[PDB]
């Protein structure tokens, strides 16, 4: 909708299931949980939840930004990322390279006294020009929380360096912003990990070309004293193309008998093609 | 079913006279010879009359049309005569599959005989055959008998274009088409006559019967990744890829030999093209995928896809055959993208059970007989459990997956052979504490091979595209090529690992992963490549990465690092081996005939026949090979001439010969003989290190 | 009252350091222990985990809570991920080492293991950084509602943990050299929010 949110990382960690494997990009789950925790660290959780439950609030997944915006590959029409100029060139039939945006390398770490803790952490070290840019509805609240995030890191194993970034809030190129909708009816692509409400699951599962991601893991909490695993949901990945747009939800994936709500941003944001 | 069983046995014994026409030969027709030889074997009137009239009793016309659609003295040609070079002949020598002996690599000089030992094979057939029940229970072991014996004798063997497919594959594919014809005709209902549309008109060829079904066990590779347990997990997926085929043919009115390619994840079939078949395919796909949801939860997914092809599409035509595979793989890819039913995700979104099973199966991995039980453990299907048993048995079987033997293990009924597995010599925590030679010197190093066939997915459907724009590319040639690759990489590898201190964890041709002890690991890789290229006469090659690791290390880091090595080998020319590192990626032929057989023998022959030069000279040569300025040529020249004079004048001549060889492959500009010499010195100074 | 009051210093190696690596294939005469490095720039780094753990184990020797709220604890519900974000440290003086003539940013120290009788040696090549390398060190501390009674006490632990890391080695094969380090230019500055940094920069330096 509104402006991009360019994020220059230099050694982040975006774990996909295991600590030993980073996945070069983070879904809207992770940026929304990051904004919720940075709003809870400040005094403004309820204002951000009032903005997020409102319909106009958008978040999309992170995609590489070496000089221009990239987009996920639309599943099934003719890679994993396309230049914003090369989307319509790809969809009519062409071939591209999956450009090296980062080096995903593992580092061996230990805990020396314990003599059984010998672990590895996979790090996506970006390549001196690549950033990630969530697309969002611009607000003073959101820029406040996002410029708070850039000194608090993003992803996994932060407080050990991994994930600390810096902002550039740039306007959208005008050939991109034409194609960002939520209510179009013909041949649209989700560029965020969404999940339809049950009235649209039928129409999305029938005429939709998609991918499943299992969003699971532990629920971070300052109020539980032990760590409980979330409710392990499955959702449509980025680049999933559909018959038309759907209306998604913020899934409550709270543990059983749990104090606060563990949310999950699966509201969509779409790209026309 | 009493019609279909007799139809199947007659369709396999279609051409059994064509081995009896050879052993104790005559001039009379092979149909009469087989149909009179079969009369001395249990005297089934329907099957014998079907053999009487296969090459001219409604059942015999099915066999007559099945021979025609299956088709499309002189010894059997090899299947790799047809790939991308029109220059070899290289025929076979028909004896047996022994399954525990050395292969019969096709020689270029075996074109002549085609007569010698067929009496012994015919006596084997008469011996195991004649006392037969011809029920549907014994419908299984006759295919195993044919692939054991008739697999290296040729088919019709006249000088015409085919010359290649065996008798055990022509008969197999004929039984496939015959059962498909019988199902299409009996579920269309009209069968009066069978002869009324087949023998008298050829308008039956131009309509869509015969759906070629297929599937793909997606997520097989990431499911696999405490190392014998990894072999057990890969073999678990292999038996699942068998049991899907077996149960899908059980739900139909079929058995095996309605089958093609198996192994890995892919499999291909030939079915009826009735409505009954496609609704039971959709039903079986739904049922097995909700099984996989119940146990594996999207880590595994079966996607059946199919294409209905007319009979004249295979008869010839070169492009519509790949169009049939295109329709198939398009449906497979569509269901691979669009995984699930609606409520199977709605219901889905709101110490261990099967890992205890895989632990017990990792215990039972050492057996040979594998049994399908109702409730024993290791579920491999809806209402199915999988157990590994010895001959202390006879507890409620439903199939017996006998192991790679398939003839001596084929003594029990209901025996499907499986080709996987074997040679775990010692446990993996001892392979680096070995190597430990009898002289007592060598470096304590695990090694691991990952080798794969280069250009293999291109090979299965485009290898036969070269020789002729009107490409050969039969259904039967693709079947025999897949059978050759599964017969090489999953059986014969256990004989190339005969006494070589290693353990082969999994092997399918798509990837072969073999941990072991490093001298015999490199020897195993060299023997595997040379035996492979004698097996295939080039035109199809393999590339390998051989890591090297100390003991007490993981097998995830290890497998990943040598995966990076095999990928750096893939990037070279995809015919290449990368020993130990991201450099050192040699071509495989230069590694064999210019590192082992040329440079390292000339290094070993020097340093074991002289006493004055030792390790220190070798280390200082390794450094000059590793730096290599223009100045280090002069510095190496000075060093070697300076060590000429220091020798005893009795070894000054032999040191002078080594001086000339080392300086000549140091100052060679081409940079081949320099890094090859560096690796030869690394291996030599590895294999002579003490404790 | 939410503030982030980022510490920024210069890690000058007063003895060259060797913070480890990942065990890979080493050849015969090659390096038996290379340093951890940047994959894209091939320069020596100091990971933030190797200052967090080192400073934490040094402050655990002094302070027995005070320690859990700076370095986190997966138990103790109020101190889970507490109040400090470390960062990887990269070479700040890459050009000042090109000025005074230095070929490589790493040295290779040859070394051995004379093994008591037989008294046969056993060599070793380990890679170090060099002893005028200076690394751009950052450390983000955070102010919140629970902080405001205990902010001053959390600087007499950070400054004390840097003073301890001075007179200890840092990251690797120390206790026989290898780790001596000086912190230059301790200064704190608010990079988000509002907090007076002049009161603790007096307590620093």
Q: Are B71 and B163 in contact (CB under 8 A)?
A: no
Task: State the residue for tokens 């000549």.
Answer: B664
CB atoms within 10 A of CB A109: 20
What tokens appear for A41 in the block?
A: 């660290």
Closest alpha carbon to C66 in C185, C151, C163: C151
Give the separation between CA B415 and CA B389, rounded to whole angstroms.
13
Give yes or no for a cis peptide into B418 (omega within 30° of 0): no
Closest alpha carbon to B679 in B592, B607, B572, B617: B592
Give the separation between CA C47 and CA C37, rounded to whole angstroms.
9
In order of B148, B315, B400, B413, the CA distances from B142 in angstroms are 10, 28, 15, 10
Beta bridge partners of B517: B446
Give the separation between CA B653 and CA B638, rounded to whole angstroms.
17
Give the separation between CA B142 and CA B416, rounded to whole angstroms.
10
Give the separation between CA B36 and CA B43, rounded to whole angstroms.
10
Task: State the residue for tokens 């029920």.
Answer: B135
Q: Are B442 and B531 in contact (CB under 8 A)?
A: no
Q: Are C53 and C46 in contact (CB under 8 A)?
A: no
Helix then strand then coil, in percent of chain B rounded to 5, is: 50, 10, 40
> Which of C21, C26, C29 to substitute to test the interface with B, most B CBs within 10 Å?
C29
CATH number, domain of B573, equals 3.30.70.270
The SS3 assignment for C113 reads coil
Q: Are B509 and B452 in contact (CB under 8 A)?
A: yes
Give the separation between CA C128 and CA C13, rounded to whole angstroms.
11
Q: Report CB contact under 8 Å: B342, A212.
A: no
Task: Give me the half-sphere count of Cα atoms (radius 13 Å) on the Cβ side of residue B362.
Answer: 16
What tokens appear for C162 in the block?
A: 């840097």
Q: Report CB contact under 8 Å: B626, C29.
A: yes
The angle formed by the CA atoms of residues B432, B433 and B439, to the nearest 5 degrees, is: 105
Listed in sequence order, the residues at least 6 apart from A207 whose beta carbon sits closer than 8 Å to its beta carbon are A242, A243
CA dihedral of B427, B432, B438, B441, whole degrees rounded to 10: 180
What domain range is B464 assigned to?
428-595
Measured in Å, how far apart are chain C's first and last C-alpha atoms? 26
What domain range is C108 assigned to?
1-205
Listed in sequence order, the residues at least 6 apart from B333 whose beta carbon sits closer than 8 Å to its beta carbon are B305
Q: Report CB contact under 8 Å: A205, B557.
A: no
| Domains identified in chain C, total number | 1
Q: Report CB contact under 8 Å: C23, A108.
A: yes
Q: Is A208 on the interface with B (CB under 8 A)?
A: yes
Give yes or no for a cis peptide into B193 (omega within 30° of 0): yes
Beta bridge partners of B387: B371
Q: Are B681 and B666 in contact (CB under 8 A)?
A: no
Chain C residues whose CB is inside 8 A of the A151 CB are: 4, 6, 85, 140, 191-192
DSSP H or E stretch at residue B345: helix B343-346
What tokens appear for B524 in the block?
A: 């195993």
Q: Report CB contact under 8 Å: C27, B581.
A: yes
CB atoms within 10 A of CB A122: 21
Phi, psi of B179 (to 5 degrees): -65, -35
Give the separation between CA B174 and CA B13, rounded to whole angstroms.
10
Across the B:C interface, residue pairs with CB atoms under 8 Å apart total: 19
The SS3 assignment for B329 reads helix
Q: Report CB contact under 8 Å: C28, B619.
A: yes
Give the separation between CA A72 and CA A237, rounded to whole angstroms.
10
The single-letter DSSP state of residue B489 is I
Q: Are B256 and B245 in contact (CB under 8 A)?
A: yes
Q: Are C168 and C54 in contact (CB under 8 A)?
A: yes
Structure resolution in Å?
Answer: 3.2
Closest alpha carbon to C161 in C11, C49, C61: C61
> Which of A205, A207, A231, A255 to substitute to test the interface with B, most B CBs within 10 Å?
A205
Measured in Å, how far apart are chain A's first and last C-alpha atoms? 17
Q: Which residues of B256-284 are buried (b: 16+ CB within 10 A; e: fewer)?
A: bbbbbbbbbbbbbbbbbbbeebbebbeeb
Residues for chain C: how many in total?
205
Give the separation between CA B221 and CA B685, rounded to whole angstroms.
37
Give the separation between CA B437 and CA B445, rounded to whole angstroms.
13
Q: Are C170 and C137 in contact (CB under 8 A)?
A: no
Q: Report CB contact under 8 Å: A198, B337.
A: no
The angle formed by the CA atoms of residues B626, B627 and B628, to the nearest 5 degrees, is: 105
Listed in sequence order, the residues at least 6 apart from A97 whose beta carbon sits closer than 8 Å to its beta carbon are none
- Three-state SS for B101-166 is CCCCCCECCCCCCCCCCHHHHHHHHHHHHCCCCCCCHHHCHHHHHHHHHHHHCECCCCCCCCCCCE
Listed in sequence order, the residues at least 6 apart from B579 whose beta carbon sits closer than 8 Å to its beta carbon are B522, B546, B548, B586, B591, B679, B683
The SS3 assignment for B308 reads strand
Question: In chain A, which residues are followed by a C-to-N distance beyond 2.5 Å, i.e. a gap?
Answer: 78
In order of A179, B121, B447, B584, B585, the CA distances from B545 in angstroms are 47, 42, 10, 10, 9
Q: What are the E-state strand segments in chain A? A: 4-7, 15-16, 18-22, 70-72, 81-83, 102-110, 118-126, 134-135, 167-168, 180-181, 188-190, 212-215, 233-236, 241-242, 249-250, 265-266, 270-272
Listed in sequence order, the residues at least 6 apart from B394 whose beta carbon sits closer than 8 Å to its beta carbon are none
Phi, psi of B372 (to 5 degrees): -100, 115
DSSP assignment string, A63-94: ---SSS-EEEPPTT----EEESSSHHHHHTT-
CB atoms within 10 A of CB B165: 25
For the CA atoms of chain C, what is the radius of gyration?
19
Give the separation between CA B243 and CA B250, rounded to whole angstroms.
10
Give the separation between CA B347 and CA B345, rounded to whole angstroms.
5
- The distance of C48 to chain B (nearest Cα, Å) reads 24
Chain B residues whose CB is inside 8 A of the C25 CB are: 547-548, 561, 580-581
| Strand duo B400-402 + B415-417: pairing | parallel
- The distance of C120 to chain B (nearest Cα, Å) reads 12
Q: Are A212 and A237 in contact (CB under 8 A)?
A: yes
């Amino acid at each position: 909708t509104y402006k991009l949110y360019i994020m220059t990382f230099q050694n982040a960690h975006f774990g996909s299931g295991t600590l030993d494997s980073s996945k070069l990009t983070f879904s809207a789950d992770r940026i929304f949980s990051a904004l919720v925790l940075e709003a809870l660290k400040m005094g403004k959780l309820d204002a951000f939840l009032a903005e997020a439950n409102q319909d106009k609030f958008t978040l999309t997944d992170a995609f590489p930004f070496q000089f221009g915006p990239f987009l996920p590959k639309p599943i099934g029409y003719p890679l994993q990322f396309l230049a914003l100029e090369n989307v319509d060139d790809y969809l009519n039939g062409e071939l591209f390279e999956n450009e090296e945006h980062a080096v995903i390398d593992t580092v061996t770490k230990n805990q020396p006294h314990k003599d059984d803790n010998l672990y590895q952490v996979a790090t996506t070290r970006f390549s001196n020009d690549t950033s990630l840019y969530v697309i969002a509805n611009e607000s003073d609240l959101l820029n406040e929380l996002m410029s708070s995030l850039q000194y608090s890191g993003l992803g996994g194993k932060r407080s050990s360096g991994f994930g600390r970034f810096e902002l550039d809030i740039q306007n959208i190129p005008l050939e991109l912003s034409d194609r960002l909708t939520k209510n179009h009816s013909d041949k649209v692509m989700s560029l965020t990990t969404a999940l339809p409400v049950d009235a649209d699951l039928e129409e999305a599962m029938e005429d939709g070309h998609y991918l499943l991601t299992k969003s699971s893991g532990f629920a971070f909490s300052h109020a539980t004293n032990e760590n409980y695993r979330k409710q392990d949901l499955y959702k449509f990945a980025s680049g999933s193309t559909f018959s038309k747009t759907f209306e998604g939800q913020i899934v409550d994936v709270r543990p059983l008998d749990f104090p606060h709500a563990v949310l999950n941003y699966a509201k969509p944001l779409f790209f026309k093609l | 079913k009493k019609e279909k069983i007799d139809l199947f046995y007659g369709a396999l014994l279609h051409n059994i006279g064509k081995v009896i026409q050879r052993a104790t030969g005559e001039r009379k027709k092979h149909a009469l010879v087989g149909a009179d030889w079969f009369d001395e074997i249990a005297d089934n009137q329907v099957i014998s009359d079907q053999i009487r009239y296969h090459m001219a009793d409604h059942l015999a016309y099915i066999t007559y049309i099945a021979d025609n659609i299956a088709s499309g003295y002189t010894n059997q040609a090899d299947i790799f005569n047809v790939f991308g070079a029109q220059t070899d002949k290289r025929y076979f020598k028909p004896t047996v599959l022994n399954l525990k002996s050395k292969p019969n690599f096709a020689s270029a000089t075996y074109e002549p005989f085609s007569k010698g030992d067929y009496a012994a094979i015919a006596t084997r057939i008469k011996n195991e055959l004649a006392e037969f029940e011809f029920n549907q229970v014994q419908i299984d072991s006759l295919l195993n008998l044919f692939e054991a014996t008739l697999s290296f004798v040729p088919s019709s063997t006249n000088t015409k274009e085919i010359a290649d497919i065996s008798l055990a594959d022509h008969s197999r594919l004929t039984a496939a088409f015959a059962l498909a014809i019988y199902d299409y005709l009996e579920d269309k209902g009209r069968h009066n006559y069978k002869e009324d549309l087949f023998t008298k008109v050829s308008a039956f060829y131009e309509e869509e019967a015969f759906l070629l079904a297929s599937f793909d066990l997606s997520g097989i590779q990431d499911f696999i990744y405490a190392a014998k347990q990894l072999k057990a997990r890969s073999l678990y997926l292999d038996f699942m890829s068998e049991y899907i085929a077996d149960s899908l043919l059980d739900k139909l009115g079929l058995n095996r030999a309605n089958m093609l390619y198996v192994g890995g994840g892919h499999a291909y079939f030939v079915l009826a093209n009735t409505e009954k078949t496609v609704e039971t395919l959709v039903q079986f796909e739904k049922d097995f995928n909700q099984f996989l949801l119940a146990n594996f939860q999207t880590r595994l997914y079966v996607a059946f896809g199919w294409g209905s092809f007319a009979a004249k599409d295979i008869m010839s035509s070169p492009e519509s055959y790949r169009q049939v595979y295109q329709k198939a793989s398009r449906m497979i890819s569509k269901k691979k993208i669009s995984r699930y039913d609606y409520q199977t995700l709605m219901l889905l979104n709101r110490v261990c059970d099967i890992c205890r099973g895989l632990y017990q199966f990792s215990k039972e991995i050492a057996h040979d007989h594998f049994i399908i039980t109702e409730n024993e453990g290791l579920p491999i299907g809806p209402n199915a459990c999988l157990k590994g048993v010895a001959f202390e048995k006879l507890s409620q079987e439903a199939f017996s997956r006998v192991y790679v033997k398939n003839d001596y293990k084929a003594g029990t009924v209901k025996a499907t052979h499986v080709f996987v597995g074997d040679y775990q010599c010692d446990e993996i925590y001892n392979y680096a504490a070995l190597s430990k030679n009898e002289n007592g010197l060598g470096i304590k190093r695990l090694a691991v091979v990952r080798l794969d066939v280069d250009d293999l997915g291109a090979a299965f459907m485009a290898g036969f595209s070269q020789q002729g724009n009107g490409q050969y590319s039969t259904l039967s040639r693709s079947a025999t090529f897949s059978r050759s690759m599964s017969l090489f990489f999953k059986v014969y590898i256990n004989q190339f690992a005969s006494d070589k201190k290693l353990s082969i964890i999994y092997a399918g041709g798509d990837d072969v992963f073999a941990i072991g002890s490093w001298q015999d690991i490199i020897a195993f890789t060299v023997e595997l490549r040379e035996n492979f290229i004698k097996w295939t006469n080039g035109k199809l090659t393999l590339s390998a990465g051989i890591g090297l690791f100390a003991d007490k290390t993981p097998i995830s880091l290890m497998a990943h690092q040598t995966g990076e090595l095999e990928e750096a080998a893939k990037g070279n020319e995809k015919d290449s081996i990368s020993l130990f590192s991201s450099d050192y990626t040699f071509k495989f032929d230069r590694f064999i005939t210019n590192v082992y057989d040329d440079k390292l023998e000339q290094i070993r022959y020097f340093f074991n026949h002289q006493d004055e030069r030792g390790k220190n000279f070798i280390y200082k040569l390794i450094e000059l090979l590793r730096n290599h300025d223009r100045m280090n040529m002069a510095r190496l020249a000075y060093y070697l001439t300076r060590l000429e004079e220091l020798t005893r004048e009795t070894d000054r001549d032999k040191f002078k010969t080594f001086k000339n060889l080392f300086y000549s492959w140091y100052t060679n500009k081409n940079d081949k003989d320099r890094k090859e010499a560096e690796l030869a010195l690394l291996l030599y100074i590895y294999e002579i290190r003490k404790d | 009252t939410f503030a982030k009051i980022k510490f920024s210093a210069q890690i000058r190696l007063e003895t060259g350091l060797h913070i480890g690596g990942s065990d890979a294939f080493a050849a015969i005469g090659a390096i038996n222990s290379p340093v951890i490095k940047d994959p894209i720039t091939n320069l020596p780094i100091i990971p933030g985990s190797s200052l967090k753990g080192k400073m934490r184990t040094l402050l655990a020797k002094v302070y027995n809570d005070i320690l859990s709220r700076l370095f986190g604890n997966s138990k103790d519900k109020r101190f889970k991920m507490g109040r400090l974000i470390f960062r990887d440290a990269f070479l700040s003086n890459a050009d000042e080492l090109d000025s005074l003539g230095v070929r490589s940013y790493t040295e290779v120290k040859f070394e051995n293991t004379i093994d008591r009788i037989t008294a046969e040696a056993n060599p070793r090549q380990i890679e170090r950084a060099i002893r005028n390398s200076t690394f751009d060190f950052e450390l983000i501390y955070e102010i919140t509602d629970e902080n405001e009674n205990q902010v001053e006490e959390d600087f007499k632990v950070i400054r004390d943990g840097l003073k301890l890391l001075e007179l200890d080695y840092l990251g690797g094969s120390g206790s026989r050299g290898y780790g001596k380090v000086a912190f230059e230019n301790l200064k704190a500055t608010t990079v988000f929010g509002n907090y007076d940094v002049k009161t603790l920069n007096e307590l620093l330096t």
